[PDB]
Amino acid sequence: VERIVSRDIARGYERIPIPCVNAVDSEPCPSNYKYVSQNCVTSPMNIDRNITHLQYCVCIDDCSSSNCMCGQLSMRCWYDKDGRLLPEFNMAEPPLIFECNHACSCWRNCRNRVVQNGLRARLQLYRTRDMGWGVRSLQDIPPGTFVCEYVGELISDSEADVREEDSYLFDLDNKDGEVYCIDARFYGNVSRFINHHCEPNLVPVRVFMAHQDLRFPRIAFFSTRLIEAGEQLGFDAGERFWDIKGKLFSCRCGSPKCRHS
């Protein structure tokens, strides 16, 4: 039998509530982290927010033409009129997306603004049978839809390397040198609870909105296919996750094509 153990894990910070339910055991809503709806820092990250450093468009329309500078930075604007990724979008190898920003000449409702409008989908935190908490969708989500952002505490690679709890670390860049990470252990949103799946229905895309400091992309999950009402959300956590974790437990995503069990 299912119990609703919180009407909203976000305490009103999202556009809609994200309830938590438990149909498995007697655990209450998890409370050992702080829910935040946008990234935070502890130690300063010094993200470059110089407004004169932004590249911006001068569009006189709704940014649906191929002249839009911000589309050009994105290679093209990938959003259709309903804010979903075009079928031509390369989900195997996503480009960087540059949405419009407060320096652009366009209006706040232009075509090229999706991730900046925040989480819209009806999601639910729930107790899985054997993977702790997971996140499901309460409604059908068409392909190419923005589902949620991986939100947390922005930290250096160095600091990430000594965090004892590494279940919630997300690298922002795969290169060496000056690189950064989101840790959603202590501060995070609903995305911290998404489990790994070997055939995922979400893909992470790097996005720039209010600043274009390439050291700090924001991580936006889009649906890779129709996700049906009730389905668990999953993304591929990748080799830099399983190279560590696979020595501790195997994957329980249950996919017939599972690669980590």
Binding site: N174, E239, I244
Partner: peptide, 9 residues
């Protein structure tokens, strides 16, 4: 490697 597990895009 790195010392801690990281998700990567």
């Amino acid at each position: 490697t790195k010392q801690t597990a990281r998700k990567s895009t």
